[PDB]
Design a protein around this ligand. Structure first.
Ligand SMILES: Cc1c(C(=O)NCC2CCC2)cnn1C
Length: 435
């Protein structure tokens, strides 16, 4: 009770203090067979996290590590298998019984305590993002079963406060996914969550629209910039998993971008976010048009939107800020692949009016960016910046394979940059073998 308290407090200390386990997930997994009883004492953990001390308090770093370990135990209990990259998966009657009982315990416990955890740690971006990994493991039918409506209201309150207080992409994405899970995965609670979600979106679209209007009518203030960026960030996060097309966000993103090209003075993050949001609008417009039975004018309206946006992304390759170029480049390489002839697979030849062939100018600009921003002369930031350039090339590779860009001009560039491997590689290879 307080015994298990010491053992957990020390488990959190051994984790942080030794570099004998890099990953909380792997520490939890390794101890799982020997210490399941302890590692599922969630009452003990939430008590450590929520109580005020008598003596000796927990540090921010140990609080963070307990939350990260707690969430790892919640996963392992619910999935009843080792974590990704310790796998090898057929449960006994008693493992299956233990899994169901564990899912019941952690659901009842965290429906009650997760709102309290979010309240207390509301301002800490890393902690909140970790805590919001918990609902995915809930047996959500229990929100009805337990007359537990009061606690669903409480989580929704706390997600609203979190979304309202934060702009970090991890927090916002955690919030987006938590609404997604609450809605479409039990009818009983669907209607209540939909109401809270659309009210949250409503308040954010209003503040966004008023801020767009402020920024563009305006001399332009650092307040004007913050208001546009901050609200657009929230809406961009949600627009991936939530269909926000009912709110015409593409229209205002389009003005922000047109303004940024014309007068060349739109802050980089507003352009990047505006590009992402516009993209998510278009992808959702496309899904409604596939699944529907769309008319001629339906198709020709989505086309005008998509051609106007392809134009914007092209112009944005010329933006001074490389984060804009990369965003514009990534979207060009997605959209040119989606609105390719592929779109007329699975008996969907109705969509022909939506098909796009990039002109010469665009193909050449998509070649330039590869030469200038994938293949560059010159810690942790650099393994990350390299995986990105890999993804940019890989995205662009797909266009080459299906002849959407000039596949010869592309390989000419791959020649140029591989030369030293094709000129000296064998000699370098065998040299390095004998050392
Ligand atoms: C097999 C190989 C070579 C090679 O055969 N080099 C000779 C050619 C350069 C002009 C003639 C270089 N890189 N790798 C991988």
């Amino acid at each position: 009770m307080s015994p298990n308290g010491n053992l957990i407090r020390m488990l959190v200390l051994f984790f942080l203090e030794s570099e004998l386990h890099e990953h909380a997930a792997y520490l939890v997994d390794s101890l799982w067979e020997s210490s399941q009883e302890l590692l599922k004492d969630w009452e003990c953990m939430t008590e450590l996290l929520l109580e005020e001390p008598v003596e000796e308090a927990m540090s921010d770093r140990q609080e963070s590590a307990l939350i990260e370990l707690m969430v790892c135990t919640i996963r392992q209990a619910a999935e009843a298998h080792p974590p990704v990259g310790r796998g090898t998966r057929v449960l006994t009657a008693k493992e299956r019984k233990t899994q169901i009982d564990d899912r019941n315990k952690l659901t009842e416990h965290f429906i009650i305590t997760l709102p309290m955890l979010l309240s207390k740690y509301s301002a800490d971006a890393e902690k909140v993002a970790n805590l919001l990994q918990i609902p995915q493991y809930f047996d959500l039918e229990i929100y009805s079963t337990g007359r537990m409506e009061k606690h669903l209201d409480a989580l929704l309150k706390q997600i609203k406060f979190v979304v309202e207080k934060h702009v970090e992409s991890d927090v916002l994405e955690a919030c987006s996914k938590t609404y997604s899970i609450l809605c479409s995965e039990e009818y009983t609670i669907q209607n209540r969550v939909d109401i809270a979600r659309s009210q949250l979106i409503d308040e954010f679209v209003d503040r966004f629209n008023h801020s767009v209007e402020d920024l563009l009518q305006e001399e332009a203030d650092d307040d004007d910039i913050y208001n546009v960026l901050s609200t657009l960030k929230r809406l961009t996060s949600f627009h991936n998993a939530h269909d926000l097309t009912k709110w015409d966000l593409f229209g205002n993103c389009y003005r922000l971008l047109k303004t940024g090209i014309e007068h060349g003075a739109m802050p980089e993050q507003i352009v990047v976010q505006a590009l992402q949001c516009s993209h998510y609008s278009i992808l959702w417009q496309l899904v409604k048009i596939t699944d529907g039975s769309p008319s001629k004018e339906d198709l020709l309206v989505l086309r005008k939107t998509v051609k106007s946006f392809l134009a914007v992304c092209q112009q944005c390759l010329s933006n001074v800020n490389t984060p804009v170029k990369e965003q514009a480049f990534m979207l060009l390489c997605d959209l040119l692949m989606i609105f390719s002839h592929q779109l007329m697979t699975g008996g969907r030849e109705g969509l022909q009016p939506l098909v796009f062939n990039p002109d010469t100018g665009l193909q050449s600009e998509l070649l330039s960016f590869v030469m200038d921003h994938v293949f560059i002369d010159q810690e942790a930031n650099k393994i990350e910046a390299l995986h990105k350039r890999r993804n940019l090339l890989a995205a662009f590779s797909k266009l080459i394979i299906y002849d959407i860009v000039d596949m010869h001009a592309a390989a000419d560039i791959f020649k140029h940059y591989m030369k030293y491997y094709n000129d000296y590689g064998d000699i370098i290879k065998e040299t390095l073998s004998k050392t």
